[PDB]
Amino acid sequence: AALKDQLIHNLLKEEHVPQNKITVVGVGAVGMACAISILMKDLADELALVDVMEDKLKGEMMDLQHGSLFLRTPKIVSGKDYSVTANSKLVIITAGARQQEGESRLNLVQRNVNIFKFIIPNVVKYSPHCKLLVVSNPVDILTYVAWKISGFPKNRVIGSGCNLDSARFRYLMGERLGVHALSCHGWILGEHGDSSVPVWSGMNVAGVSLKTLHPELGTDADKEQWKQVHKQVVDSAYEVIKLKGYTTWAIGLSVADLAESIMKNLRRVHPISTMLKGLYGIKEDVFLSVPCVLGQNGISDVVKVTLTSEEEAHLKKSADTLWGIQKELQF
Amino acid sequence: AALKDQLIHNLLKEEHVPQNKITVVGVGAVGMACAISILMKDLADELALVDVMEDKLKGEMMDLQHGSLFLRTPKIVSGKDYSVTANSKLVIITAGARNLVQRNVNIFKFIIPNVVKYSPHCKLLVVSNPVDILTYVAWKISGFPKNRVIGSGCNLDSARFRYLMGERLGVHALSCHGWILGEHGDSSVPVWSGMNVAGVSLKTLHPELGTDADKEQWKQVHKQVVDSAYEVIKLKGYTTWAIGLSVADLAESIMKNLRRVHPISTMLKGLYGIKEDVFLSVPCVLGQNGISDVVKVTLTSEEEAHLKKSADTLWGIQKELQF
Amino acid sequence: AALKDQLIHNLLKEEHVPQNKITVVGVGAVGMACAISILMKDLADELALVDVMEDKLKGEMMDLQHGSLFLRTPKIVSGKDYSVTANSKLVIITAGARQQEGESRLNLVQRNVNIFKFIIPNVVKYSPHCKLLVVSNPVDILTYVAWKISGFPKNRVIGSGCNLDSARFRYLMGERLGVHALSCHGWILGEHGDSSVPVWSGMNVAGVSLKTLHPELGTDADKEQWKQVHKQVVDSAYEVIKLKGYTTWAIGLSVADLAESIMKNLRRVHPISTMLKGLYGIKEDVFLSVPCVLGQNGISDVVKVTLTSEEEAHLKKSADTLWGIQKELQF
Amino acid sequence: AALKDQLIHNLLKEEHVPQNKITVVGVGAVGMACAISILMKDLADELALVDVMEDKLKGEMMDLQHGSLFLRTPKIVSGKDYSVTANSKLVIITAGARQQEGESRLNLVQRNVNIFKFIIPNVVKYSPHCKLLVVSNPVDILTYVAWKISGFPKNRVIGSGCNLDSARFRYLMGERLGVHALSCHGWILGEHGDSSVPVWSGMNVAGVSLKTLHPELGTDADKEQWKQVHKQVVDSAYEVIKLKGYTTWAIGLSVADLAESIMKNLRRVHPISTMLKGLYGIKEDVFLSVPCVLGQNGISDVVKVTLTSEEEAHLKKSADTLWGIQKELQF
Ligand SMILES: COc1ccc(Cl)cc1NC(=O)CSc1ccc(C(=O)O)cn1
Ligand SMILES: COc1ccc(Cl)cc1NC(=O)CSc1ccc(C(=O)O)cn1
Ligand SMILES: COc1ccc(Cl)cc1NC(=O)CSc1ccc(C(=O)O)cn1
Ligand SMILES: COc1ccc(Cl)cc1NC(=O)CSc1ccc(C(=O)O)cn1
């Protein structure tokens, strides 16, 4: 008698189980950028959102849903309780607390750990086999904490690390050179942020080494000052926060790119943070960005970049600072 | 020589004239949502963003540029000076003021002649509320022929409706068809007679459809479409995602000359019993020249009178305003 | 040390299992158009091809493989042995014999059945849970046949049926009208071919009944002879064949469209062929095109279109004729 | 009143002229693969096909047309008469005469010169400002021919050159290394064919030079025999033809990638053949593959690769033999 039943004859009981499902944890400006980039790239057949801010949660979920005519991701859900995230191939974490002044690095990072003590177990319970991608800062350390708290093998716990910074360094590289970033190549590795290492030996267009053309590249004797480009990169995020109150669009597109490799098993290489104990001369349990082959199983391989000894030195110094810090956290 | 010069030999001295450029005026939640959707559908070779808050503007430009590696739109610019909108094929107006209209009219009195001076041949796509009026304002102030001035109108609301249709029937909104026309807002018309799946008229299956006696209360569905913007602002302060997607849908049809039919707001004098310079939503054919054709929807006599009611309502408001 | 091992440190042992695998059976021109349309729409993470022409089979593979820089489907495999199609989500059947002179159509039909008898049981073996999509002609019969041989439930066995006819119908509609096919709605239902049913009562633009606007629509006394539009649809595969010698592109795009709804669980409605014993006044075991909600479990519901009386008789007549062919067959 | 009139009210009585029109010359397998690849990448608002095979020409057009529901390219046209190609932004030449013997190079080539003598003038007549993209073999020679006949300036005449070959190389690379070709980088430059120059020096993953890791790379003493990878690239067109009768898909995909940089002004760098007199030591009017910046004005800049003295002389030899051939042609 109903309209649905008058119009439509049903022939198949539900058994609805998601196939390529993604969850974004945290619907702050970063998460929703991740959400929208992912939805517009068609990477999932179900997206789940989670956060503690129930009102903002339902609202974002509703806005995205009203866009369905324009999407090809048939189901969007959200909630306080993590069972809406059940059976994710990928779980992306952007949840954070924002630092007070005085607070101090250490206490800030311990509150975030406090968030992962609640957030990580819940994800793991409902998606034992998901890959985790952390974006929260500080990224290298909070990723380590996800690895520790989830009990996941290191290949399934990925840190967004220096993915966007590299993209960045390539856009600026392209601005100076006059070609598209897609065709500008360069890697920023190691610890995310100002302590990141710009591998000047690797930078090229068309396989043409720029440090060979221009031996002063990056060094302090450089008439063209290419180290300031790295600087621009490292500073560009605060600079944007300074100008619009936060950043979103780039980090989201950056995450969508990672998500695509994962969800499509592309085995592309990205500068993202992984557990590198053993490699690049690192002996502590620390996550850093190195070129990783990324796919349906997370990080499967690492490209061994030939670093100078000063670069090898840089990373080795981040491992210590990191570990020092992680050593002082309460799990 | 300089490293760029060691690396690259110039052979052509480059006449940079955008061929598929798009401008979004206003970088609030709405306009940015429009920008990010447009970038991601690969619709423009150039995007320009104009506003009046210069930091906010500069920082949105920078945030979008940083993602260039992941985009296929090679140039993104911004600034308070409208020289940056030069040569746009399409200019999207999301600017608006926190009675108002005359205030919004005042804003448009500044923005629109600027847009017209730098892109004489662009199409205007008004999104800011109150949208049927602001679209009339832009058209009047612009000097443009009417096909080149579009209101976003009932497009999104028709998207919401189909979404909700598809929740009650269990098929994707893509396969649920239903039109909302007229004044964008509480006084819009749910055209019951055209709601169908696979060409199967719901109203014929269920004549009570949309009536108060409707045991299924499909009338609530139109009310829910008319309330949802307000409901969503209530939850998260504003709305964005769905409006941006629907604007990019319109962008798409224009920049590829698809000639798709959308429920958008056009200067409909001479149609539907209407005799005023008003913009109302009707099924428009939409392409490289903006609105070029309108579908003449067959209406019940009440629906016909509801449209006339909104023409005179809109006209009455405009008669105050000064340009 | 091999260059590989020198460049890349392996951290995982992989046991590759494909997550969104699609197979196309038959690398004729229809199958290869399906193939390219799917690879360009990013619907699968692995694509496998099979045929009996082992050389044609290896050339198509390589040729696709060579386009990998431009694709996002990491893995493309091919072979005469169906081992290569294992664990497919969706298997598309474009295999078929072409006639002699000479032989009867009934006997050309049997010959195709003897191909399916060999092909279907092999697909089932390596992809028990796959959805079957049959494209080969005559499609309503061969879909039934794939159904009976497979022993699959009816939801998981889909005939491409009238989905292209309807797209053409809509394209030709928008030519007459000056609107894009996306915005013309009209349905071709029933049997694929000369006896299919243009449902005139449902033709519209923006929900405006052309029928109500013009009561002659589809009538013999129609000054505008819209009927001839149906005729063009029925004849268009033919007209195309006289001209270029086969059709490919259009059927290929339309197959990918059906593939996108399945792989993404969109639950859109398509004019496709399904086992409709029980509905539409059909008392026989035959496949006919009706509007079907199509998703990750194939056809889950169908929309019941109010047919005029002249129209029910067409479908019941088509069902009688099909059944009677189906009885003259050897499984 | 006509149904279309009852239904639609015309407001704009407007005109024609397309904004992003692309033409494909030649509806052989290569040009059609170019057609479908372009249509699924949403690169055009109008696509025109032209060829002398009138039936085949109209057949392909109609087959593409029937897929309009699924495309976002509103207008597809075809014709023996080049008025159909009017106002293209890009014109892709894939025409050619087929072998038989007595290919006194300067003869089977001479018959393609003569095909160009008819086609190019017709292209230039109706698309005065278009970009010319030549794919026909022999490509570097036929691109020069197109250049001389059209009278276009060098930036607007483009040969597909080694764009596809480098992509295959990158593909074979990713097979040896176990990453996607997207992440492997290397350049094949110079004369498209056996005499093309694999630039070993520039091969790399994530900026890490392979020839540095492994100095035998590309030499005979290479126990890994990476020299056979360049040779397998040179040969793969042949192998494929040997298997399937011709090659389509990869040349179609790569050409659509060039199309993309042009139509979007991306200024990406592609290994394509440009008129390079004055660069790379070459003093004759010839076309070679070097890294080119490709945008809305064609080839605007050229990346100067650092070459060995062997590579350089090798490029010179290709330049002098191309020229030797070009002198022997009749315009
Ligand atoms: C700021 O907290 C969150 C942000 C995003 C998401 Cl998705 C979830 C959360 N919060 C939680 O998941 C609850 S656990 C917790 C622990 C400490 C603090 C604090 O120091 O403020 C907040 N929550
Ligand atoms: C609210 O003003 C704007 C917002 C977004 C954009 Cl893109 C441009 C603007 N505003 C302008 O372009 C300057 S003209 C003007 C007139 C009145 C008011 C007012 O009522 O406060 C504001 N501006
Ligand atoms: C025409 O045969 C095929 C076409 C495409 C594919 Cl993928 C597979 C095939 N054929 C087979 O898989 C072998 S079984 C068979 C049965 C009858 C005939 C006949 O009547 O000529 C041919 N083969
Ligand atoms: C076969 O030639 C063509 C192939 C594709 C296209 Cl689009 C156009 C053509 N051909 C033409 O444009 C006609 S001119 C000509 C000159 C020489 C020969 C010959 O030596 O066989 C053939 N035609």
Short mmCIF file of C-alpha atoms and ligand atoms in Angstrom, two decimals, chain C residues 24-28 50-53 80 82 93-98 100 103 107-108 110-119, ligand 3:
data_model
loop_
_atom_site.label_atom_id
_atom_site.label_comp_id
_atom_site.label_asym_id
_atom_site.label_seq_id
_atom_site.Cartn_x
_atom_site.Cartn_y
_atom_site.Cartn_z
CA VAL C 24 36.35 -9.19 -19.15
CA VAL C 25 35.78 -12.39 -21.12
CA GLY C 26 36.54 -11.99 -24.80
CA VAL C 27 38.96 -9.42 -26.16
CA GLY C 28 36.99 -8.83 -29.29
CA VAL C 50 40.65 -14.14 -21.23
CA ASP C 51 40.01 -15.52 -24.67
CA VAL C 52 41.09 -18.52 -26.72
CA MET C 53 43.09 -16.50 -29.22
CA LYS C 80 43.70 -18.71 -21.64
CA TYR C 82 40.82 -18.97 -15.97
CA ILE C 93 30.89 -11.90 -20.76
CA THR C 94 31.42 -10.58 -24.31
CA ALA C 95 32.36 -13.93 -25.83
CA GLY C 96 30.54 -15.22 -28.88
CA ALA C 97 30.64 -16.96 -32.24
CA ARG C 98 30.02 -15.17 -35.51
CA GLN C 100 28.66 -18.89 -41.15
CA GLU C 103 23.85 -21.76 -40.42
CA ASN C 107 22.16 -22.90 -34.52
CA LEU C 108 24.31 -19.82 -34.07
CA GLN C 110 23.41 -23.11 -29.70
CA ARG C 111 27.04 -22.58 -30.75
CA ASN C 112 27.17 -19.62 -28.33
CA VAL C 113 25.62 -21.83 -25.67
CA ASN C 114 28.41 -24.36 -26.20
CA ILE C 115 30.87 -21.52 -25.59
CA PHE C 116 29.08 -20.51 -22.37
CA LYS C 117 28.96 -24.18 -21.26
CA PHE C 118 32.72 -24.07 -21.34
CA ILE C 119 33.21 -20.51 -20.10
C1 LIG E 3 34.03 -18.24 -30.44
O1 LIG E 3 34.70 -18.81 -29.30
C2 LIG E 3 35.10 -17.96 -28.21
C3 LIG E 3 35.06 -16.49 -28.22
C4 LIG E 3 35.49 -15.68 -27.09
C5 LIG E 3 35.96 -16.32 -25.92
CL1 LIG E 3 36.48 -15.39 -24.54
C6 LIG E 3 36.01 -17.79 -25.88
C7 LIG E 3 35.59 -18.64 -26.99
N1 LIG E 3 35.64 -20.09 -26.97
C8 LIG E 3 35.94 -20.96 -25.93
O2 LIG E 3 36.07 -20.53 -24.72
C9 LIG E 3 36.13 -22.46 -26.26
S1 LIG E 3 34.52 -23.30 -26.19
C10 LIG E 3 33.80 -23.06 -27.85
C11 LIG E 3 32.54 -23.65 -28.14
C12 LIG E 3 31.97 -23.45 -29.46
C13 LIG E 3 32.65 -22.66 -30.46
C14 LIG E 3 32.04 -22.45 -31.85
O3 LIG E 3 30.87 -22.72 -32.06
O4 LIG E 3 32.83 -21.94 -32.87
C15 LIG E 3 33.93 -22.11 -30.06
N2 LIG E 3 34.48 -22.31 -28.76
#
